[PDB]
Amino acid sequence: GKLPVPWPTLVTTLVQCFSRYPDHMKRHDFFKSAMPEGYVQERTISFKDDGKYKTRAVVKFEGDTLVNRIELKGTDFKEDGNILGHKLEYNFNSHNVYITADKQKNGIKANFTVRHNVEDGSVQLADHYQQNTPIGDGPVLLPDNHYLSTQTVLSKDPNEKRDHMVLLEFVTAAGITGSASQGEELFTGVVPILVELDGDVNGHKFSVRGEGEGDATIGKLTLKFISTT
Numbered sequence: 642g643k644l645p646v647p648w649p650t651l652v653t654t655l656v657q658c659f660s661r662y663p664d665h666m667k668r669h670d671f672f673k674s675a676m677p678e679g680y681v682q683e684r685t686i687s688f689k690d691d692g693k694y695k696t697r698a699v700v701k702f703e704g705d706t707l708v709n710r711i712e713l714k715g716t717d718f719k720e721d722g723n724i725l726g727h728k729l730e731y732n733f734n735s736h737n738v739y740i741t742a743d744k745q746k747n748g749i750k751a752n753f754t755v756r757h758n759v760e761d762g763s764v765q766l767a768d769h770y771q772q773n774t775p776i777g778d779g780p781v782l783l784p785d786n787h788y789l790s791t792q793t794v795l796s797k798d799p800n801e802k803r804d805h806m807v808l809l810e811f812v813t814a815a816g817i818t819g820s821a822s823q824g825e826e827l828f829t830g831v832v833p834i835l836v837e838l839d840g841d842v843n844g845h846k847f848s849v850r851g852e853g854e855g856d857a858t859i860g861k862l863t864l865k866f867i868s869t870t
Contacts, residue, residue, distance in 0.1 A: 644868045645845035646715070647729040648806040649757055651866075652793065653769060654684070654696050655836050655851055656709050657738075658828065660789050660812040661860030667821040669784035669814070671740075671749050671773065673857070676824035677702035678777030680748065686755075689766040692718030692843065701776065706833045707855065715842030723757070723765045725843065730758040733793035738771075742783040748774040749784065787816040804868040808853075812860045828857035834864060846870070 658672035679701025686694040698711040738753045751771040775781045796807040820826050836851035853864035
């Protein structure tokens with residue numbers, strides 16, 4: 642039942658195609674341009690003074706639903722560290738996700754450092770290295786350097802007995818002074834989302850299923866995640 646890691650450490654792993662790209666930046670939205678066939682998103686997340694997650698996800702449409710299916714492997718964690726010891730506050734700070742084009746792989750890379758507040762007032766860093774490669778053969782949009790700025794609130798469903806996380810998130814693109822891709826047009830209204838994660842952290846196996854919807858015109862995600870362990 643209960644997740645063996647804190648819910649906040651899974652937020653970034655658990656759909657950047659729902660980011661709001663302002664009109665002047667629409668030519669830099671790789672994520673939507675790869676749809677419907679989608680992209681593979683891989684990360685290494687290094688928790689400083691602790692272990693790391695390695696993740697590989699496939700993000701694509703299945704019919705009307707945008708699906709994010711992830712495999713997560715965590716290693717080198719400390720038994721009594723902030724992660725396995727459940728010492729993280731149940732909140733999420735604002736971050737800037739710095740994106741660069743990866744012209745050779747026809748995709749993008751991203752780098753950013755998440756700050757997780759610890760219950761004793763210290764901070765636990767989670768350094769993210771990310772790469773995305775399109776699955777389809779069709780042309781994608783390769784961006785100039787820019788970033789995504791995020792805001793997130795975490796809450797609970799008062800009638801949900803399972804270990805779970807209610808998440809609301811807004812993300813908008815910034816940093817660069819009609820539709821620019823056909824994939825962009827798949828996001829013009831509210832789009833249902835399914836997330837499935839299978840995880841193993843230091844031998845602790847768990848799974849998470851999330852459902853909700855995204856509204857890329859406003860950069861909004863509304864999702865409820867449940868630990869199906």
